[PDB]
Write a structure and sequence with these properties.
Blueprint (H helix, E strand, L loop, with lengths): L7 H7 L13 E6 L11 E6 L22 E5 L7 H13 L3 E7 L8 H12 L3 E4 L2 H10 L14 H17 L4 H7 L13 E10 L2 E4 L5 E4 L9 H6 L13 E9 L3 H13 L3 E9 L7 H11 L1 E5 L2 H11 L13 H16 L3
Parallel strand pairs: 3-4, 4-5, 9-10, 10-11
Antiparallel strand pairs: 1-2, 1-3, 6-7, 6-8, 6-9
Helix pairs in contact: 2-3, 8-9
The structure holds zinc ion.
Zinc ion binds next to helix 8.
PDB class: hydrolase/dna
Keywords: apobec3G, antiviral defense, hydrolase, DNA cytidine deaminase, HYDROLASE-DNA complex
Entry title: Crystal structure of a soluble variant of full-length human APOBEC3G (pH 8.0)
Length: about 350
């Protein structure tokens, strides 16, 4: 096609909410700059560029929204991948330093690779006054009609477009709200032993430092995450095991890490956590699980090895469920209404855990 545009191939390669991740870390970006006016027949200035790194042409519009008389701008990004850790931080800084510009980003794929600095950068970019959404059918349809040299060819979506779009929107909302959905918590954090449809695994984590003679909660370190499964993926415990290194814990001070898990760790995750806590002796790791993942009879050895290495394994009760509801979900002031059979299943799983811990 002509210069400055992309073709159906590059579009269908960069803009896709499907399991095919990214062998090559490239990111395409389509920008629409418009003068913030009252009219609907305004001239929308459209451009697009891929990540060249050496020269950075994707930020060529930065000079296009400079302070000129009394003009405001409504920039719209149609970025392929999600912004980088540093790109989002610098964009938030620019938005703070330029009040005459508003920003609306439509992301197609979220950086599944998690990082507290990345999440903090996204939340700060959202705090600076920018809107962030996930591309749906209308966004891909509009981008295909203006930034692709389609020789009279209409847009043809993929099968699981909305199915992946809603899941990515849920993950986005979890990232930006800094809290999981209430229905998601009620669904995944159930208490019955045998359940169906709980494919994913969520995990909340809290950190407490030992100061004076008590456990002072490091409130800026509490968080939560989910599994990725999916490209393939790991489990929730393994995904949590490489977030601890980014915490930069002191080594001659002791800490307590509390992990509220929807599913109990499997055998591989149990052995990995056992090795981790055998290496890091300055962290006391306690696990409160809602359900006991049987793991086809291989989880008893994992739990016993974890307890041997040194952990306080226990089953979540009403108090832990209520604490997780009040601290981790977007309840918006609503109380924690427990489901039927809470204490019954809690004490049943407590007795079962007791039986498993005594080599039985
Ligand atoms: Zn596992």
């Amino acid at each position: 096609g002509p210069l400055g545009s992309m073709d159906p191939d590059t579009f269908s390669d960069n803009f896709n909410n499907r399991p095919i991740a990214s062998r090559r870390n490239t990111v395409y970006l389509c920008y629409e700059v418009k003068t913030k006016g009252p009219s609907r027949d305004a001239k929308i200035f459209r451009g697009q560029a891929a990540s060249e790194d050496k020269y950075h042409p994707e930020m060529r519009f930065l000079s296009l929204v400079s302070k000129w008389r009394d003009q405001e701008y409504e920039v719209t990004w149609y970025i392929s991948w999600s912004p980088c850790t540093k790109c989002a931080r610098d964009m938030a800084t620019f938005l703070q330093e330029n009040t005459h510009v508003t920003l609306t980003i439509f992301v197609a794929r979220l950086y599944a690779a998690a990082d507290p600095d990345y999440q903090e950068a996204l939340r700060s970019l959202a705090q600076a006054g920018a809107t962030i959404k996930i591309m749906n059918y209308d966004e891909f349809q509009h981008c295909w009609s203006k930034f692709v040299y389609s020789q009279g060819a209409p847009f043809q979506p993929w099968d699981g477009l909305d199915e992946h779009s809603q899941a990515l929107s849920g993950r986005l909302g979890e990232i930006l709200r800094h809290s999981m959905d209430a229905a998601t918590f009620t669904f995944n954090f159930n208490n019955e032993p045998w359940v169906r449809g709980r494919h994913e695994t969520y995990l909340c984590y809290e950190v407490e430092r030992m100061h004076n003679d008590t456990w002072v909660k490091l409130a800026q370190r509490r968080g939560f995450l989910a599994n990725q499964a999916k490209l393939e993926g790991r489990h929730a415990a393994l995904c949590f095991l490489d977030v601890i290194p980014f915490w930069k814990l002191d080594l001659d001070q002791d800490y307590r890490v509390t992990c509220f898990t929807s599913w109990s760790p499997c055998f591989s995750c149990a052995q990995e956590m056992a090795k981790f806590i055998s290496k890091n002796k300055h962290v006391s790791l306690c696990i409160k699980t809602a359900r006991i993942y049987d793991d086809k009879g291989r989880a008893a050895e994992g739990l016993r090895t974890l307890a041997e290495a040194g952990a306080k394994i226990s089953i979540m009760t009403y108090s832990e469920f209520k604490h997780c509801w009040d601290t981790f979900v977007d309840h918006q002031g609503a109380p924690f209404q427990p489901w039927d059979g809470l204490d019954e299943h809690s004490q049943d799983l407590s007795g079962r855990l007791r039986a498993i811990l005594q080599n039985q």
